[PDB]
From a paper:
In response, one family of large bacteriophages uses a nucleus-like compartment to protect its replicating genomes by excluding host defence factors. Here we find that the bacteriophage nuclear shell assembles primarily from one protein, which we name chimallin (ChmA). Combining cryo-electron tomography of nuclear shells in bacteriophage-infected cells and cryo-electron microscopy of a minimal chimallin compartment in vitro, we show that chimallin self-assembles as a flexible sheet into closed micrometre-scale compartments. We find that the shell is primarily composed of a single protein, chimallin, which self-assembles through its extended N and C termini into a closed compartment.
Further reduction of the structure to focus on an individual protomer resulted in the highest quality map at about 3.1 Å resolution, enabling atomic modelling of the chimallin protomer. Chimallin folds into a compact two-domain core with extended N- and C-terminal segments. The N-terminal domain (residues 62–228) shows little structural homology to any characterized protein, adopting an αβ fold that is topologically similar only to an uncharacterized protein from Enterococcus faecalis. Although chimallin lacks the acetyltransferase active site residues of AtaT and related toxins, this structural similarity suggests that the jumbo phage nuclear shell may have evolved from a bacterial toxin–antitoxin system. The chimallin protomer map contains three interacting peptide segments from the N and C termini of neighbouring protomers. The N-terminal interacting segment (NTS: residues 48–61) of each protomer extends anticlockwise (as viewed from outside the cube) and docks against a neighbouring protomer’s N-terminal domain within a given face of the cubic assembly, thus establishing intra-tetramer connections. Two extended segments of the C terminus (CTS1: residues 590–611; and CTS2: residues 622–631) establish inter-tetramer interactions. Notably, the binding of CTS1 to the chimallin C-terminal domain resembles the interaction of the antitoxin AtaR with the AtaT acetyltransferase toxin, further hinting that the phage nuclear shell could have evolved from a bacterial toxin–antitoxin system.
Numbering used by the authors:
A (entry chain A): 62 to 306, 319 to 581
B (entry chain B): 590 to 611
C (entry chain C): 622 to 631
D (entry chain E): 48 to 61
E (entry chain D): 280 to 285
């Protein structure tokens, strides 16, 4: 009766911290502690990185817990009952990392930290949990652990500085007064992006913001000084409106997966999040959201084929791409005749990701007991970013900011033949391609996602069965995420407010 | 009861076009 | 439902 | 560039 | 109390 994935991790982290301090990379001002599950009676053991300062004589402690799930032990499952006619049955669900980190868990962690550090009445502030995925060998993953430790220290410094109170980041200071301009570059990708711990993330459209400083006969050709600010990963999905059979049958919804800053920038502040998120709306400058749909020349993975859209069209068969006659001449005609011109913007909020502190805030703003406070905080932050007077473009009193669609998305990875990929590659188009002519199977798959009648546990069961049926037997789930839809007017108001606030971005 | 589609996705759609200096 | 978690803002 | 010097969070990266 | 622990 013992746990062996905590002591080894603690030893590795202590050695890494010693090495980093030796190389003059960090400062010996933080502590690393172990949260054993055996002597605290908690679901999962965790590692906490605590850094403390003093504010007006009151000690303040910032903590960044790291959950350590283990595959050698099984947590008890959750039972639910549903009724069908005269018979009742029991469904056995599964428990994720997110449900483990509850209020009681954080309370016990804070009490333990306060007792350990010698300060019983010290204030404790969270900095954002980040679980360490299982099936990861700690012996040969030193680089990821080092980067994660550095990022955790940076996050603790960020939250401490935010609590202390510093100058907000504003776009008025981005002028540079040196005759430079900001340019935004769009990009279409096919290989998934990677997290700080190697977790793949699906990313088809990437929007970045750079600084263009070409003044004159500039020297240092082919050399750039970290001219990059933001990066947003987006991918498009198709949704079908319930109309019986001039409006196009399908409507395109764009999902935002990851928002992050440049690698060089070591600071993360709330006003940077909105500035980075404002780049999402710029993807509609030249219908760039439709670029991944066009066929590529030479290869055909047959997973993202757009010809499947003809399965439910007036003609039963599928439209055949990869043909000599087919080109961009009638690809536009197809998109005009079967896709709505305007897209929809959605975000996949995750309470355990790197940007947990904003995903939780947006989830609270979407709906709950803390609905007014979150909206007021968001409005205050947006006012702080770029001067003020946001009331002229938006009115949070009588206008929702974020809306919850009641959809839960699993987070996992499946090992393709070549390399590990992301579980979110399976979408409506992928399912339509998988089920060639069987309309009933596609309708069942679509209902397994957003059926309001079905219990969420049953929908999750059907979604887990479909993934095994289509993708393969190598699927490995890692977490949970929730999908939300932004207000249509909010995005436009934010974009117009930033544009009027002296921000000028040029591109193709 | 059988699913038929999303009757609420069509309410939120961007009407304007991205504003860039170009 | 609408389960919530700790928030540093409030 | 100047952003890092304006905030100066402890812990060098890259 | 002590949920998720046996």
């Amino acid at each position: 009766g013992g746990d062996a994935r905590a002591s080894e991790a603690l030893t590795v982290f202590t050695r890494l911290k010693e090495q980093a301090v030796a190389q003059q990379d960090l400062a010996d001002d933080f502590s690393i502690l172990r949260f054993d599950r055996d002597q605290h009676q908690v679901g999962w053991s965790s590692l906490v990185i605590a850094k403390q300062i003093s504010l007006n004589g009151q000690p303040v402690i910032a903590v960044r817990p790291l959950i350590l799930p283990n595959n050698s032990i099984e947590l008890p499952k959750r039972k639910t009952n549903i009724v069908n006619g005269m018979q009742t049955d029991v469904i056995e669900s599964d428990i994720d990392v997110g449900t483990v980190f509850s209020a009681q868990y954080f309370n016990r962690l804070s009490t333990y930290v306060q007792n350990t550090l010698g300060k019983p009445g010290a204030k404790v502030v969270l900095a954002g949990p980040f679980p360490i995925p299982a099936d990861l060998v700690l012996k040969d993953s030193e680089l990821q652990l080092r980067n994660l430790l550095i990022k955790s220290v940076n996050a603790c410094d960020d939250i401490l500085a935010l609590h202390s109170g510093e100058r907000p980041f504003t776009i008025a200071g981005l002028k540079g007064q040196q005759g430079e301009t900001l340019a935004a570059k769009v990009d279409i990708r096919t290989q998934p992006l990677h997290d700080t711990v190697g977790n793949p993330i699906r990313a088809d459209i990437v929007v970045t913001t750079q600084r263009v400083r070409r003044n004159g006969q500039q020297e240092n050709e082919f050399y750039e000084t970290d001219v990059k600010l933001n990066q947003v990963a987006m991918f498009t999905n198709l949704e079908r409106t319930p109309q019986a059979q001039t409006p196009a049958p399908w409507v395109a919804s764009v999902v935002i997966t990851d928002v992050r800053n440049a690698d060089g920038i070591q600071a993360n502040t709330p006003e940077m999040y909105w500035f980075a998120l404002s780049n999402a709306f710029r993807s509609t400058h030249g219908h760039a959201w439709a670029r991944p749909f066009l066929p590529m020349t030479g290869v055909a993975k047959d997973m993202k084929d757009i010809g499947a859209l003809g399965w439910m069209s007036a003609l039963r068969n599928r439209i055949d791409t990869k043909a000599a006659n087919f080109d961009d001449a009638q690809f536009g005609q197809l998109m005009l005749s079967q896709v709505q011109p305007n897209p929809v913007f959605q975000i996949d909020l995750n309470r355990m990701g790197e940007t947990a502190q904003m995903d939780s805030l947006q989830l609270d703003a979407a709906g709950g007991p803390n609905a007014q406070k979150a909206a007021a905080t968001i409005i205050r932050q947006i006012n702080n970013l770029g001067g003020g007077g946001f009331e002229r473009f938006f009115d949070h009193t009588t206008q929702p900011i974020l809306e919850r669609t009641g959809q839960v998305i699993d987070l996992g990875n499946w090992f393709d033949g070549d390399e590990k990929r992301d579980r979110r590659d399976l979408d409506n188009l992928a399912a339509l391609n998988a089920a060639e002519g069987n309309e009933n199977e596609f309708w069942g798959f679509y209902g397994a996602q957003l059926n309001p009648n079905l219990h969420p546990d049953l929908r999750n069961r059907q979604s887990r069965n479909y993934d095994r049926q289509y993708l393969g037997s190598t699927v490995t789930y890692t977490g949970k995420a929730e999908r939300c839809t932004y207000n249509a007017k909010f995005i436009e108001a934010l974009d117009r407010y930033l544009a009027e606030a002296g921000l000028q971005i040029t591109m193709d």
